[PDB]
Amino acid sequence: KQAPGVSIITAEDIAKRPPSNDLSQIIRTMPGVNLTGNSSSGQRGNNRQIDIRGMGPENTLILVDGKPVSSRNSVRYGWRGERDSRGDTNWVPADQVERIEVIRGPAAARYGNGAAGGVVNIITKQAGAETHGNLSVYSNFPQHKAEGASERMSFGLNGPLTENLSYRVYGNIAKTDSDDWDINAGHESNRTGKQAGTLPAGREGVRNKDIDGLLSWRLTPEQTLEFEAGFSRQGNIYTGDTQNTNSNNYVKQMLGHETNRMYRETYSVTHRGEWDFGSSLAYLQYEKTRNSRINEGLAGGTEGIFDPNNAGFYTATLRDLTAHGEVNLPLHLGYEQTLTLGSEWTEQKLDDPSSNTQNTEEGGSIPGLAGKNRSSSSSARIFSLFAEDNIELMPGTMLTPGLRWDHHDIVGDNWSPSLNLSHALTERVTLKAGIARAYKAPNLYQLNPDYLLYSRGQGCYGQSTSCYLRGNDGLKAETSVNKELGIEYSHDGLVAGLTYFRNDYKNKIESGLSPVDHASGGKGDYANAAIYQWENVPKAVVEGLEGTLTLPLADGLKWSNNLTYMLQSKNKETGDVLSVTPRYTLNSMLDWQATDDLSLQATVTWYGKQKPKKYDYHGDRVTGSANDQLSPYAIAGLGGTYRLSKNLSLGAGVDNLFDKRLFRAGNAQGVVGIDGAGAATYNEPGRTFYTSLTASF
Ligand SMILES: [Fe+3]
Ligand SMILES: [Fe+3]
């Protein structure tokens, strides 16, 4: 379940610690994984997503059955590197998941674009020899009414049609109620003048509808052909969230209402080949995402609030195309090795009728940029070749060198080499070392010279004057040399391991610090605004420790621990943080198999201190409550699963036994009328009872 760099979560695991709704809840408990925003602003801070080794969630590649999920690329990427997105780990319903693979650092670089942090591969339950199916229900019950309860119903059904043609289908309906509009009342940052009365929001709610169909066709003994279609729909339940935590009547009108809906549609063709020489796989996925939400402004304090002058919904459309071919070849030589060879092709078309609409009246005009009716359209194609050689030098030792080459049709050529070594020092002890250079293509917002944000000064680096931020098709890809050295003892279910990891982070893309130019014209003081671009930061570094320890107390009883400790996270240009994570994270489960038919689980999570950014948007040291830190805290939980028969199981338990609660005070830094909240940017839910029921043949 735990080796150096890699973690498996099983169906049994998902069953014993059931997630409310989103899988982030259980994925986050792996070594090296945190649940954070992408950068340090704290904006959309209750919209936290999976972060691997402090590299940010933009650098965590989500797969379902080896096929990319790109849906969040349909939400506007803002000035501070946050999207008003709930993430991409809530597309597959928990109880139809067979297992989840988390691959962190050098082992993950081979998966290419956006695996700089690592890969999360959500694997579905597949067709059997006989026909099987299940019906799963979960429902939680919070102590405090403010906090949103969650309800979940999902079914699965698979088997053969013929001797040579199988199917699997699943369908899910779920809802997570929003936190009450006022849950953060009495905890909010100091708010004065026009902003008096404003509130930082609790967690957005969501309604889910997921339907997947798959047909497997075994054409010959050594040939399988898979067809699947996927239809999902998330509509939110709004509870007052805005980028800057400003308010207006339109905001208040929409409390309790759907203000965004994401439709995600997937069709996939997969051919799987198995013959004497070796093995083949190749797939075509077409992902179509419709991001329908309410118009928001793109300037200063109006960036990320419902725009009352332009009321109503727009729809952003993401058409994502993925094709991949691989062959694996057993090879006999001076060393017993295996060669895998592969191409990959991806196309991302983005239609956004809202992001590209900032006009140049107030700040003056930009040479090369039309003020009105700029294109809605952005697109990027990567072509990729790769080979990986998995070389046995001698029993116990694998050396795995791989080369990936990527041609980005704007940014240019990338060379991502990799080397992964594992060494049996003993039967019980294994040393593992890895150094790879991973790859990040700029997102379609960073890349687009039509994409334009504006501030009168309050968000401008190194001045108080009006300034534009502009997309930059001149950008380099972000690369990271992910190093890792680890050791693990494993024997008779006794596991003890410790890994050190360092990712040297080159060309991290971010809102610029120096004006590249000035505009001409516009109104009064705001006239002739400074122009910044999305720039590559030369150097940043993350560094830390992953530990695991599993002790079998008795035959019936297992004590498991995962440790993350984050040593360093530094933008070497500004000296500020990349992300804000807990200094450490210790997850502790006691698993007692009390009877043949009863299992009992106690868990504790310890979170270390959390520190905010040192510098504001200007680059100036922040002061007062913008410096506030979150103290270390713990969350404990009990549960059980009572098996009534081979065909019926029940679960029940309590998350957060001792009701430790935290409250979003606002964003990290001060603005006019809204004091900063430092690290206090998210809501930690209180005591919550839950029950579950699973019927299966
Ligand atoms: Fe007034
Ligand atoms: Fe402003």
Relative to beta strand 688-696, strand 648-655 is antiparallel
The answer to whether residues 669 and 694 touch, using CB atoms and an 8 Å cutoff, is no
Q: What share of the chain is helix, strand, coil (3-state, %, to 5)?
A: 5, 55, 40
Quick one: which H or E segment has residue 317?
Answer: strand 313-331
What secondary structure letter does DSSP report for 611? -
**Four-point Cα dihedral 613, 185, 638, 237, nearest 10:** -90
The answer to whether residues 481 and 116 touch, using CB atoms and an 8 Å cutoff, is no
Which numbered ligand comes closest to the C-alpha of 456? 2
Which numbered ligand comes closest to the C-alpha of 297? 2
- Distance CA(64)–CA(62), nearest Å, equals 7
C-beta atoms surrounding 375 within 10 Å: 11
The answer to whether residues 580 and 566 touch, using CB atoms and an 8 Å cutoff, is no
Which numbered ligand comes closest to the C-alpha of 244? 2
Which numbered ligand comes closest to the C-alpha of 193? 1
Residue type, 329: L
Which numbered ligand comes closest to the C-alpha of 303? 2
Distance of CA 566 to the CA centre of its chain: 18
Longest CA pairwise span in the chain (Å): 79
Rounded to the nearest angstrom, the distance between the alpha carbon of 616 and the centre of ligand 1 is 27
Which numbered ligand comes closest to the C-alpha of 458? 2
- Distance CA(278)–CA(330), nearest Å, equals 6
Rounded to the nearest angstrom, the distance between the alpha carbon of 458 and the centre of ligand 2 is 5
The answer to whether residues 32 and 108 touch, using CB atoms and an 8 Å cutoff, is no
Q: Which of 678, 669, 696 is nearest to 244 (CA)?
A: 669
Query: CA separation (Å) from 282 to 62, 67, 123, 223, 629?
Result: 19, 11, 17, 12, 49
Which numbered ligand comes closest to the C-alpha of 617? 2
Q: Which of 143, 144, 148, 255 is nearest to 199 (CA)?
A: 255
Query: CA separation (Å) from 24 to 6, 87, 120, 506?
Result: 17, 9, 10, 28
C-beta atoms surrounding 425 within 10 Å: 11
The answer to whether residues 379 and 347 touch, using CB atoms and an 8 Å cutoff, is yes
Quick one: which H or E segment has residue 12?
Answer: helix 11-16
Q: Which residues surround ligand 2, an ion (CB under 5 A)?
A: 300-301, 456, 458
Which numbered ligand comes closest to the C-alpha of 305? 2
Relative to beta strand 530-554, strand 467-470 is parallel
The phi and psi torsions of 360 (rounded to 5 degrees) equal: -115, 20
C-beta atoms surrounding 430 within 10 Å: 20
- Distance CA(76)–CA(297), nearest Å, equals 11
Relative to beta strand 118-124, strand 60-64 is parallel
Which numbered ligand comes closest to the C-alpha of 79? 2
Rounded to the nearest angstrom, the distance between the alpha carbon of 506 and the centre of ligand 1 is 48
**Hey, is 221 helix, strand or coil?**
coil
Residues 6+ apart with CB under 8 A from 381: 345, 346, 347, 348, 408, 409
- Distance CA(585)–CA(206), nearest Å, equals 28
Which numbered ligand comes closest to the C-alpha of 459? 2
Q: Which of 51, 36, 39 is nearest to 571 (CA)?
A: 39
Rounded to the nearest angstrom, the distance between the alpha carbon of 276 and the centre of ligand 2 is 66
Residues 6+ apart with CB under 8 A from 291: 71, 74, 75, 260, 262, 315, 316, 317, 318
Rounded to the nearest angstrom, the distance between the alpha carbon of 195 and the centre of ligand 1 is 11
Query: CA separation (Å) from 287 to 36, 76, 318, 349, 410?
Result: 26, 18, 8, 11, 22
For the chain, what's the residue count? 697
Q: After which residues is the chain broken (C to N over 2.5 A)?
A: none
The token pair at 681 is: 């940017």
C-beta atoms surrounding 613 within 10 Å: 25
Residues 6+ apart with CB under 8 A from 166: 127, 158, 159, 160, 215, 216, 218
**Hey, is 157 helix, strand or coil?**
strand
The answer to whether residues 198 and 186 touch, using CB atoms and an 8 Å cutoff, is no
The answer to whether residues 484 and 5 touch, using CB atoms and an 8 Å cutoff, is yes
- Distance CA(582)–CA(607), nearest Å, equals 6
Residue type, 330: P
The token pair at 72 is: 């969040």
What secondary structure letter does DSSP report for 622? P
Which numbered ligand comes closest to the C-alpha of 467? 2
Residues 6+ apart with CB under 8 A from 560: 548, 549, 550, 588, 589, 591
**Four-point Cα dihedral 186, 189, 195, 196, nearest 10:** 40
- Distance CA(501)–CA(435), nearest Å, equals 10
Roughly how many angstroms between the first and final C-alpha of the chain, as a whole number? Answer: 26
The answer to whether residues 298 and 357 touch, using CB atoms and an 8 Å cutoff, is yes
In the numeric block, the tokens 């050190």 are attached to 500
Query: CA separation (Å) from 324 to 269, 296, 385, 401, 444?
Result: 11, 37, 10, 20, 22
Residues 6+ apart with CB under 8 A from 83: 38, 44, 72, 75, 76, 77
Using alpha carbons only, give the angle 348, 72, 27 rounded to the nearest 5 degrees. 125
Which numbered ligand comes closest to the C-alpha of 196? 1
The token pair at 352 is: 């956004």
The answer to whether residues 167 and 215 touch, using CB atoms and an 8 Å cutoff, is yes
Rounded to the nearest angstrom, the distance between the alpha carbon of 466 and the centre of ligand 2 is 9
Which numbered ligand comes closest to the C-alpha of 194? 1
Domain count, the chain: 1
The answer to whether residues 610 and 582 touch, using CB atoms and an 8 Å cutoff, is yes
- Distance CA(433)–CA(423), nearest Å, equals 9
The phi and psi torsions of 71 (rounded to 5 degrees) equal: -55, -40
Rounded to the nearest angstrom, the distance between the alpha carbon of 183 and the centre of ligand 1 is 28
Give the domain CATH number at 546: 2.40.170.20
Rounded to the nearest angstrom, the distance between the alpha carbon of 197 and the centre of ligand 1 is 15
DSSP string, 490-547: EETTEEEEEEEEEEEEEEEEEE-SS-SEE-B--SGGGSS-EEEEEEEEEEEEEEEEEE
**Hey, is 55 helix, strand or coil?**
coil
Q: Which of 605, 573, 574, 611 is nearest to 589 (CA)?
A: 605
Rounded to the nearest angstrom, the distance between the alpha carbon of 250 and the centre of ligand 1 is 20
The answer to whether residues 238 and 178 touch, using CB atoms and an 8 Å cutoff, is yes
Rounded to the nearest angstrom, the distance between the alpha carbon of 463 and the centre of ligand 1 is 27
- Distance CA(233)–CA(548), nearest Å, equals 37
Rounded to the nearest angstrom, the distance between the alpha carbon of 539 and the centre of ligand 1 is 46
The token pair at 643 is: 């098996």
Q: Which of 362, 234, 352, 371 is nearest to 296 (CA)?
A: 352
For the purposes of burial, counting CB atoms within 10 Å of the CB of 634, is it exposed (0-12), middle (13-18) or buried (19 or more)?
middle
- Which segments within 572-632 are labelled E, that is strand? 584-592, 598-607
Residue type, 112: G
DSSP string, 343-383: EEEEEEEEE-SSTT---STTT-BBTTB-SSS---EEEEEEE
Residues 6+ apart with CB under 8 A from 688: 140, 141, 142, 143, 147, 654, 655, 656
Quick one: which H or E segment has residue 25?
Answer: helix 24-27
Q: Which of 188, 144, 178 is nearest to 659 (CA)?
A: 144
Per DSSP, what are the bridge partners of residue 371? none
The phi and psi torsions of 195 (rounded to 5 degrees) equal: -95, -5
The answer to whether residues 445 and 77 touch, using CB atoms and an 8 Å cutoff, is yes
Per DSSP, what are the bridge partners of residue 369? 366
Rounded to the nearest angstrom, the distance between the alpha carbon of 292 and the centre of ligand 2 is 26
- Distance CA(220)–CA(527), nearest Å, equals 71
DSSP string, 539-560: EEEEEEEEEEEEEEEETTEEEE
Rounded to the nearest angstrom, the distance between the alpha carbon of 194 and the centre of ligand 1 is 8
- Distance CA(640)–CA(645), nearest Å, equals 15
Q: Which of 17, 117, 39 is nearest to 537 (CA)?
A: 39
C-beta atoms surrounding 533 within 10 Å: 22
Rounded to the nearest angstrom, the distance between the alpha carbon of 193 and the centre of ligand 1 is 9
The answer to whether residues 482 and 109 touch, using CB atoms and an 8 Å cutoff, is yes
C-beta atoms surrounding 587 within 10 Å: 21
- Distance CA(597)–CA(612), nearest Å, equals 47
Per DSSP, what are the bridge partners of residue 34? 51
Query: CA separation (Å) from 374 to 13, 359, 450, 528?
Result: 50, 10, 6, 21
- Distance CA(634)–CA(608), nearest Å, equals 9
- Distance CA(140)–CA(19), nearest Å, equals 10
What secondary structure letter does DSSP report for 102? E
The token pair at 31 is: 């070594």
Rounded to the nearest angstrom, the distance between the alpha carbon of 40 and the centre of ligand 1 is 33
Resolution value, angstrom units: 2.7
Rounded to the nearest angstrom, the distance between the alpha carbon of 671 and the centre of ligand 2 is 9
- Distance CA(435)–CA(599), nearest Å, equals 41
The answer to whether residues 331 and 337 touch, using CB atoms and an 8 Å cutoff, is yes
Rounded to the nearest angstrom, the distance between the alpha carbon of 351 and the centre of ligand 2 is 27
Which numbered ligand comes closest to the C-alpha of 457? 2
The answer to whether residues 106 and 86 touch, using CB atoms and an 8 Å cutoff, is no
The token pair at 527 is: 């006239």
- Structural domain span for residue 647: 2-696
Rounded to the nearest angstrom, the distance between the alpha carbon of 301 and the centre of ligand 2 is 5
